[PDB]
Amino acid sequence: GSNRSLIVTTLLEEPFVMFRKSDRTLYGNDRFEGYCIDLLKELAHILGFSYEIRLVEDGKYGAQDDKGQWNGMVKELIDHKADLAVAPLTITHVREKAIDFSKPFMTLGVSILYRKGTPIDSADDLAKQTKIEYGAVKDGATMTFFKKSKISTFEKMWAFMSSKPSALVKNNEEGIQRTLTADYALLMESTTIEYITQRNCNLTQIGGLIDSKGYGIGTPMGSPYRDKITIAILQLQEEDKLHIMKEKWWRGSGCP
Ligand SMILES: C[C@H](C[C@H](N)C(=O)[O-])C(=O)O
Ligand SMILES: [Cl-]
Ligand SMILES: [Zn+2]
Ligand SMILES: [Zn+2]
């Protein structure tokens, strides 16, 4: 064991982690802002560590291939290339077999992003039909949810998605654009839907939450920092700081 700064793996995703806008050019950690950047700053202060933020090269959250090999931030942790993954990283039972998670700092569920004014009201309506395309981000928790479901409705939807080489999108930005340009609904985590629908009055959430889960800080399996981060998250919750941080970055814009 050594004393050194922690390496934090992450990726770009609004409003969690973004390149802050400046016209003096910025280096290192100073390049970044967002809810997860604030959370990291608070966790580092409480626990007393310095750190360096590195974007994950493949830009992916993490999913397993047919051989069982991981990619994205999960793989960085597995390979011990980072000490912490600080991102909107969904805690899943499958991922827990490969990495460790703090307790959640945010909770959420899968829901549906679609246009307003349609008669679609639930995931069942989407599995019912064919005119409206639907999908999710590739190599993500939401995709894995459908690929692994044993509920008929979601097995059907996975068959649909999986077979269309367009429905599984590279990231949230491309999914949002598809919703804006084609007859397409995005399966998407509810926190990000809240973020988008507060800023785009022509989009809405369709239905409620299809499941319930949390975002946690990821560590390599067995890391001593996992329980420390958990304790610090509980302190930030008790101090009201996770509340302030959410409302800081989910500020919202006027939608009549
Ligand atoms: C984009 C998002 C990624 C998700 N937060 C994950 O950790 O895999 C999703 O899958 O819906
Ligand atoms: Cl980087
Ligand atoms: Zn290690
Ligand atoms: Zn409040």
Residue numbers in the entry: 1 to 256
Task: Give excerpts from the publication.
We also solved crystal structure of GluK3 ligand binding domain in complex with agonist SYM. Interestingly, GluK3 residue D759 from one protomer faces D730 from other protomer on LBD dimer formation. This close apposition of two similarly charged residues likely destabilizes the dimer interface by electrostatic repulsion. Binding of Zn ion at this site is shown to increase the dimer stability and potentiate GluK3 currents.
